[PDB]
Design a protein around this ligand. Structure first.
Ligand SMILES: Cc1ccc(COP(=O)(O)O)c(/C=N/[C@@H](CC(=O)O)C(=O)O)c1O
Ligand SMILES: Cc1ccc(COP(=O)(O)O)c(/C=N/[C@@H](CC(=O)O)C(=O)O)c1O
Lengths: 396, 396
């Protein structure tokens, strides 16, 4: 049965870990996968998380199965983060949330739900995007089409090209939007742009799917949700796939959510019954530990205050690194202007490096980035900045 | 988009929780979903698990992502449980394991891997089986066909009917086998029967898929794997979907494994690369907490000894309940012979009750079973046995 199976191609992101682990050179520098590091080059457990885990160890008295949709308090806390306290979507009972194994699991549940229960055949994704978006949607049988997004000459969102690309989308197609901290560009719509897209989407009949992996890493928790909220004010229906991996430092615990919104509570409840059936046929019900840590933190004033500050600390450290990177490239003799990196949002920016420069940086200098030129600024530290920048200048 | 979605049908198992929770009557008795209860009618965290969780709280210093296939030590420990220390499959590097979100996730990963990478179109499942097997396989695009299994007049495995049914399977079809503690019948092949099926499967070209949700609940950890090991000795290729939910009391932490076996290490590694690609497009990588508890326990002599005894304790308590149930039915005036229940394995036996008897038991008596007549013996206790039996006698 398995004699002719052809090997799969390298995961362009996750595959970097095997290479990095196998690299026995001392001064190797990891700017690949999107995990936050602190000033020591490590990814500690958040203190709020350790406190919540201690509380769970002391107080949990069963591991009996969650419901298919997971912990109810987690769902309520997720909806309040997405839509705001006092949102009409919440008051009108228009949204149902399933806790999922990560943001990736939330994207797969959304795709399986749409493929099996709606007329959807195509999802529109930005060029460029996270490379796993295409794989997730195709695995559910959905075609992926690309829309233009990025002007690489001026390092801006090419809004006119984006609009033009999307004119080819039919009513009933899905359009995927990154909620904030676009991966890989770091370039997000302004609020006015989000409002223009919300009105356009209603006019053209697109179903919005928001992917919200980095809420809190651009400007703040509420500010980062403004684009999604502008869409929510205008649309009867949308889907949000969100993740708590980065903003709680809970990557390996697989904590995400798929939130379905419909015109009214009767419709969302009927539609959600099919989303639950799609989950039951995949992984049955979701992992409790990470979600119970998030719900424990978000529902306790003291833990929530500690956590919000830890998130602010991460965001501010990445901003300090963007500035230190730009300043150090100049000092090490880089040819050009990299000042666009300062304005960008989230863990990632596009260095502008070619696929060959990125390969040379790994092979010759032990500096690991993604082949698209995406660099994880959150992997930069005061201690590794100089060698990193010297290596980059050397490949320019 | 969602205006016409038809509501999904009740999950015949998981749906019982909403009904049971909503039932405000005092003496309600839960014999539905397959979760173990102790003599108090509760599902505590195992002591070995609490000890391992304390160790993790003290010693974990990151939540950085696992590999797509999860914790390497967990994979090694799973293979040794499945195949035995010193197995040729392990020595020859013929098996690769992915840690998955539960046994359900392992079944879905297997199905997506087979659908996308092999000629498989059909999976053969026993009539009766767990009702979610059909949903999982159909969600991946595979047809499900049934094979005869159970003689309900004599309460035995109808081996001749099983063989006859399977003559219709073509070479390259998958046949699903429950490794031990068949759900819902509790009736497993004898070792000779397993050996006969292993030889038949090789002759007819079937790809075996073992589902191993209850290792340790029939007779013991090694004894329960004898049928799988008889198949492993005869086959170049097979797949095992296993779960640690019941045997570690870790249901909500989603701890399972998908193990692929091929003729040699080159083939299994090539085939496994595609299994990893199927996982990446589903939930990306698996939840660490529960798997790290299992690996911590299985790799430490002291914790492993505590755990093995806790599992023996669960198994023996269920056996005591089978005997107490049979004795108490007789004392409360049940018409017939229920002595077949004593011989059966695992959490479940078929009571023989009709779908209407089961509905009446819920509506009139607050006793909750599955509509197939399956009862969770592990939900029975000395304190609830008399009212339970009185109710059953009342509906006969
Ligand atoms: C836009 C976007 C959507 C969804 C995910 C997956 O997050 P999860 O851990 O499943 O909650 C990522 C994550 N990107 C990271 C890590 C990854 O590739 O797995 C990255 O781009 O390096 C992402 O960047
Ligand atoms: C044969 C079989 C294969 C796979 C599973 C799922 O276990 P997981 O928790 O995903 O590791 C069950 C579980 N059966 C239980 C609970 C359930 O239906 O979800 C049951 O039959 O009540 C099962 O009985």
């Amino acid at each position: 049965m398995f004699e002719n199976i052809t090997a799969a191609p390298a995961d362009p992101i996750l595959g970097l870990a095997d290479l990095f682990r196998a690299d026995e050179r001392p001064g190797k520098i990891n700017l690949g996968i999107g995990v936050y590091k602190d000033e020591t080059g490590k990814t500690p457990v958040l203190t709020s998380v350790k406190k919540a885990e201690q509380y769970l160890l002391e107080n949990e008295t069963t591991k009996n199965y969650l419901g298919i949709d997971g912990i109810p308090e987690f769902g309520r806390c997720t909806q309040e983060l997405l839509f705001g306290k006092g949102s009409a979507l919440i008051n009108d009972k228009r949204a149902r949330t399933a806790q999922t194994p990560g943001g990736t699991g939330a994207l797969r549940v959304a795709a399986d739900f749409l493929a099996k229960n709606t007329s959807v055949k195509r999802v529109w994704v930005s060029n460029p995007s996270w490379p796993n978006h295409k794989s997730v949607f195709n695995s559910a049988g959905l075609e992926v089409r690309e829309y233009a997004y990025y002007d690489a000459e001026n390092h801006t969102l090419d809004f006119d090209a984006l609009i033009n690309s999307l004119n080819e989308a039919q009513a009933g197609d899905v359009v995927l939007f990154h909620g904030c901290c676009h991966n890989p560009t770091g370039i997000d719509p302004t609020l006015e742009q989000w409002q223009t897209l919300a009105q356009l989407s209603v006019e053209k009949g697109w179903l919005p799917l928001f992917d919200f992996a980095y809420q809190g890493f651009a400007r703040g928790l509420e500010e980062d949700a403004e684009g999604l909220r502008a869409f929510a004010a205008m649309h009867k229906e949308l889907i949000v796939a969100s993740s708590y991996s980065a903003n709680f430092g809970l990557y390996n615990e697989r904590v995400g959510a798929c939130t379905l919104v419909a015109a009214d509570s009767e419709t969302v409840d009927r539609a959600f019954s099919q989303m639950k059936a799609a989950i039951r046929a995949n992984y049955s019900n979701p992992p409790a530990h990470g979600a119970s840590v998030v719900a424990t933190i978000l529902s306790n004033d003291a833990l929530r205050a500690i956590w919000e500050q830890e998130l602010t600390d991460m965001r501010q450290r990445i901003q300090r690194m963007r500035q230190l990177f730009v300043n150090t490239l100049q000092e090490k003799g880089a040819n050009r202007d990299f000042s666009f990196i300062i304005k960008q949002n989230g863990m990632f920016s596009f260095s502008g490096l070619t696929k060959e420069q990125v390969l040379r940086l790994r092979e010759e200098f032990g500096v690991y980035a993604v082949a698209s030129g995406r660099v994880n600024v959150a992997g930069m530290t005061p201690d590794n900045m100089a060698p990193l920048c010297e290596a980059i200048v050397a490949v320019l």
